[model samples]
Target chain A: KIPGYTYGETENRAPFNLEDLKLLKEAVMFTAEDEEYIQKAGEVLEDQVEEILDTWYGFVGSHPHLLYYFTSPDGTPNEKYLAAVRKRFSRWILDTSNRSYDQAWLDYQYEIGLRHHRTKKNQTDNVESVPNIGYRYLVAFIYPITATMKPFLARKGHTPEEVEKMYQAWFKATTLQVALWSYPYVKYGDF
Target chain B: IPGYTYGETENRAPFNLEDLKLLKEAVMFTAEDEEYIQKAGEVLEDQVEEILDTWYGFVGSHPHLLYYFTSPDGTPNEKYLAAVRKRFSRWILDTSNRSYDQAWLDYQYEIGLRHHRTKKNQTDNVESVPNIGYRYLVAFIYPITATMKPFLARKGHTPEEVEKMYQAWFKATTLQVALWSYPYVKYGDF
Candidate 1:
């Protein structure tokens, strides 16, 4: 009994990939309110994916949290992931007024820092794995924009710096949204 | 010979003696010509002033009684005023501890409550709120320390009760912030 209650021996479970890790990490890190908020972010993405796919892509759209997780890295011929990524990518376009959405990137940075400090994970492993999830999200989140702009970069029409600014904007919005969704859990947090 | 100015500061600064003793271990800089020390001092003074302003805001807003100062009815009681000032200093120290505990509370609140279910229009569905500043702890220091002494003491405190007092207070203060902030919502229409 640690705090007056009899505690049982715990069995450890492993997460398969960064997506699974994000889900599992969130389960421990977030308060109940955070769970609900994140779930809604998931829902908003879901709604957008549904609209793109003509109300189909049920398999892909089942859980928007798993939107980039279950998708191909190369984006490939999967119309659903490609379209969802395009939708996310379009949100990052210079034409769009997208500050809030970009904060998602900053939130990822914060989580990476938190995991590094608190979890005491090795520097190399954290550096590799931490941004892989962000990369996946970014690809999916801004697939439409990346697909178009990446070509522009290759052709020297768009600079990497310009592409990077888009990434920064996306990150800023996402981070704020994540905070807004997760702040309640942070304040009255449980052990 | 050093004259008898017995105050802490009057006797050289806190770490000056240690620095003097460790001069053998120190390296002298030759390359940098700018007066970094003077610039740093100016920056530090500005930062201190900013912090003092913020602290003054905290003290003025909070319902904390100035315990050292007593009301002198139609008379100037120097002793009462002096006692009040002393108590106020002690109170400031106590409030500092409260601020320390509130940092964790803010962290917890940030994780658990802030952005739970906010939509445009009416209100967010969050049932709790956290004061987002130094004095965010103003209303929170008392109950766990003053009211829940018995409960805290029941936690099998062994060995030196003297050292245990600080640890016990720290534990109680953190526990209070989490418990009180979450289970109840006082400031708004939850």
Candidate 2:
């Protein structure tokens, strides 16, 4: 188990129930068909996770504002902090692609959202970066993350139709994940 | 003043000073209300400690509310409480003075940021809870506002004058609470 990485092990429960999760999945048009494509995409991306992250890291590193989230109080990037989160981030790719929409998954998704928000931010690894990730970027990141994944989905010599299916699945899944993460950031009744 | 950085020059507020002017207006607080606001501050300046007593007593009385300020073992941290009191006291003066300049605006954002997780425990450098939960932050507007009219009356002011400044306090606190919610709001929705 990765240190500080508690997927099914967190103490507090997500306020959402299994039924709420179903409604959430429906809200985003997540289908059983998309589920199959996500599983296939996971297998296809088994080895390509590093290269994908390299692309993502490059994108974030070039933009000073994006990289600022990972910086220290002195305004310099924290290499150890970056490396630690990078490990968890790579693991996150596998988890997102392979995990089922079970209670564990829902709970962990809430954990991820809490980490992005100030509620549980900076507590796990206890690194002092920016207090919480801004809500704007959390929403804005949906584009670059999914838009760039189309090429990776195509890398396994899959048929064009299959590649497109996986791309759509990834886009849908990322949107759903971001939606779940938004729980802590949004107002109580408004969400 | 330990955790209070409002007087510092480097931070940024979520909105411009012009926006604060608009917010003041949006809350139905007019320039016509400034006289009472200033008057309210004058009445409240010396009574801050007494006002805080009632407020803190209210917080201490509620387990859920006090949860934000206590340790996991259930003891209240005196230093933490003391530090927050200093800043809270300053906030009263700032509000009453109608000091919605660049610094005051910046401090409003800071209050929201610090209250939210963005800059919460970092300023205090404490190992308390990650951040205060959101509900209480909004729920607090009532008791805080409701309790002030009593204090406003203690300065030997007539009921008419007390009522006006009481209304002024409500407008000021409500606006601050709304601003403090900046980080908690969704991107475009706010």
Candidate 3:
């Protein structure tokens, strides 16, 4: 079963992207076909490019900045895994002087997506764990957050209509992505 | 005090030549900074290209040792390449239980994808380096290994011969990484 996102705690905190739609649209449409293309793309959305970095580049990116430790089926942290993880985290967070951890994360994701595109391009696998449970949970998570931010929008001087459009677009996009149905082992296991 | 030079030496220690030159001869760099950087960049580029060609040359000389990387030169003794792949896959699988790198490192290594890479270096103006790496690894690593057994069945270079070479090469490559990883992870030896 997938776990629903909880608010007010860092355990399941997520990296917020105030402009993910604009960012992803640019990435999907990029066509320069050179390293500079990647550089420019990264420059446009450096703060919001962790997923791709961790996968393609050897970077440890922060997301839902929670104190997570690897465990088996039980909740106990696997000592070995933790040791290795600490080693990596130390190097990634510390040793990265020249290698931009952020750029690395973005590169990893970009590469993996292409790999998936080549291999599972047309294979839209479905979820069997629970029927609409994943979608319902995500929608529940998104709606409240959007609603809460609705008040802050007008205070920041964004018209209610503009804020509504942004929130709806976000809601529409997330719900439509079938890949969201991939069940995480627990509420926090973001697979 | 051993070899330490104190007193007069410390007081009259000459300024670094480079620093002195910068303080005196160096003109205020405005457009020169850009030119300097561009020239420096070209030098770095040449060095990188030289390194890459040298590295590839080293591997190319030992075709049997390096598998199908030098394919365009010939049919690329596929039989040998397949065997090499199987052994590497097993090694990677073994890493699943052993954690060859760090946990997060291992996680990134295994998943074959990352969201950070997508957002940062992947945009409308960029072509995505991560995507290129992923594609190269897929073509270079995955496909070859997946067909290991069948590769041995081909008409030339008997299955036994291919199997033997594969095991030898795989064992060598795995040990190289595993041994290197210890220094790389533990002491940054690499």
Which residue runs does candidate 2 get wrong by more than 4 Å?
B1-190
Error of 2 at A27 (Å): 1.5
- Write one digit per residue (lDDT tens) for candidate 1, span A68-99: 33344453334543443344334433212322
Per DockQ, the best of the predicted structures is 2
lDDT of 3: 0.28
RMSD, model 1, all Cα superposed? 22.9
Q: What lDDT tens digits, residue by residue, belong to model 2 across residues A45-107? A: 889999999988887887677788789999999888888888889999999888888999989
Off by over 4 Å in 3: A1-36, A45-191, B1-73, B99-189
Model 3: per-residue Cα lDDT over A96-160, one tens digit each = 11233233333332322222222221122211111111111222222222223234333444465
Ranking by DockQ: 2, 1, 3
Model 1 CA deviation exceeding 4 Å by range: A1-178, A181-191, B1-42, B54-190
Displacement of the residue B80 alpha carbon in candidate 2, Å: 51
For candidate 2, lDDT tens digit of each residue in B1-190?
A: 6766666836787678766664564444677578899999899899999999988887776665666777768788777788898989988898988467888878888888887767766777775665665445544554676678788988799978996887677777767766776777866434
Model 1, TM vs. native: 0.20
Query: What lDDT score goes with residue B178 in model 3?
Result: 21
> Which candidate's TM-score is highest?
2
